[PDB]
Design a protein around this ligand. Structure first.
Ligand SMILES: [Ca+2]
Length: 114
């Protein structure tokens, strides 16, 4: 079985986006996911791209079509209109998260002034 928690959410979210930005296969996604990395304490990683792709596909946020012009053939993932709606839900939560970080930032500056 797979990875969960915040890292889980942050991986799915990032993968969906990277797919929205350019439809692609598992292997290439990994490269763009690597150069993603982390400004986020403790997360890393990143890892099973393939299985969260299959997961986002099963859930209908992504569709698939084989590119047979290359060898070996590569299965291309593409965002669906549902996947875009799931994305707006991630977007609103990123705005939640960002507001929460800024309330801490200020709280901290106040005790550092003190
Ligand atoms: Ca298909």
């Amino acid at each position: 079985r797979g990875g969960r928690g915040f890292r889980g959410w942050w991986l799915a979210s990032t993968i969906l986006l990277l797919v929205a930005e350019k439809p692609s296969h598992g292997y290439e996604l990994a490269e763009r996911l690597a150069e993603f990395g982390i400004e986020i304490p403790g997360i890393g990683h990143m890892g099973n791209i393939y299985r969260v792709l299959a997961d986002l596909e099963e859930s209908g946020f992504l569709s698939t079509e084989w590119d047979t012009t290359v060898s070996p053939p590569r299965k291309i993932y593409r965002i669906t209109p549902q996947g875009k709606l799931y994305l707006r839900e991630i977007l609103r939560s990123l705005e939640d998260m960002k507001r929460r970080i800024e309330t801490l930032e200020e709280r901290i500056k106040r005790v550092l002034q003190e």
